[PDB]
Amino acid sequence: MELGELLYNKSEYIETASGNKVSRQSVLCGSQNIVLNGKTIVMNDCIIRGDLANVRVGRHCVVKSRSVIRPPFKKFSKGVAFFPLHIGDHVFIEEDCVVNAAQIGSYVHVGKNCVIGRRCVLKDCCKILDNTVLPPETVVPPFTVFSGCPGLFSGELPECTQELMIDVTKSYYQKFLPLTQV
């Protein structure tokens, strides 16, 4: 797979001191509560809701266009508990994804147009296939595959997936270069 240079319009993305590439169309609500660890790329129309709870994004994370990252809220009979949304390192989230997870581990790949239920916990090296609906409080064990509507356990991933995931996430950021005018 000749990972071609993902040449972007240099005017559309702001590079931060930590190396984050964030589109000008990105919606950052409660930015004081949104911590993007270095080498993160946030694409067009991405919505991150940090107003009521912290959103912590790990290293080399890629958030594709129209992805909505919202921390889950737990309603108790005496008040509403605000849970921080934790995303691990090398997490890649496809387009049109709805994320309500309490925690997403490292090396997790979330497929296109996936809906993650409130307070789901995704462990490290998890794979969610395209158009998968995870019910609330679903816990995805490490190296497991869930797919379908509802998203059911289909099988486990080989251990080699972690080694592949490291190279792809690092290469993806390196290939995401500003459009050098030819």
Binding site: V27, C29, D45, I47, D51, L52, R66, V68, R70, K75, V80, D96, V98, N113, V115, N131, V133, G148, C149, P150
Partner: protein
């Protein structure tokens, strides 16, 4: 027309003749398009991000306390009370939703059917399960919505 106590975000795209009932909250990037006729949104309704409500010509009365989750698309002529449309659900032009209906995420309601009260539609095959136990009266979820909706969004 924004009713007293309704919260409409500056990032909300509202086009046409739209009436927003009291305590209704519209999140950023919501799109409400009243082209074929006026869209009437009742009291206490929640419309989340990427929700798309279109009243289009064949080329809309929405009841009280309905929830429209992220990326929902609704073309329904009529909706009852206390309905929940989950993320990426599609409700077709000729779907009649009564009161207490739950439409699961990624369900496609294209059928010319009046959905009976207390029906849950779930799965890729849109299986209708008549809930034989009274769904816990949503009085508990309405109490949270009435106390939470005015507190988490900058009321104009």
């Amino acid at each position: 027309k924004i009713a007293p106590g309704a919260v409409v975000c500056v990032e909300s795209e509202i086009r046409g003749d739209v009436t927003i009932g009291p305590r209704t909250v519209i999140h950023p990037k919501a799109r409400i398009i009243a082209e074929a006729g006026p869209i009437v949104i009742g009291e206490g309704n929640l419309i989340e991000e990427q929700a798309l409500i279109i009243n289009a010509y064949p080329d809309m009365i929405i009841g009280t306390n309905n929830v429209f989750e992220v990326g929902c698309y609704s073309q329904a002529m009529k909706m009852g009370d206390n309905n929940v449309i989950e993320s990426k659900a599609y409700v077709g032009r000729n779907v009649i939703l009564t009161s207490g209906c739950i439409i699961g995420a990624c369900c496609n309601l294209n059928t010319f059917e009046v959905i009976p009260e207390n029906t849950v539609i779930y799965g890729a095959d849109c299986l209708r399960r008549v809930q034989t136990e009274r769904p816990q009266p949503q009085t508990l979820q309405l109490d949270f919505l009435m106390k939470i909706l005015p507190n988490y969004h900058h009321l104009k």
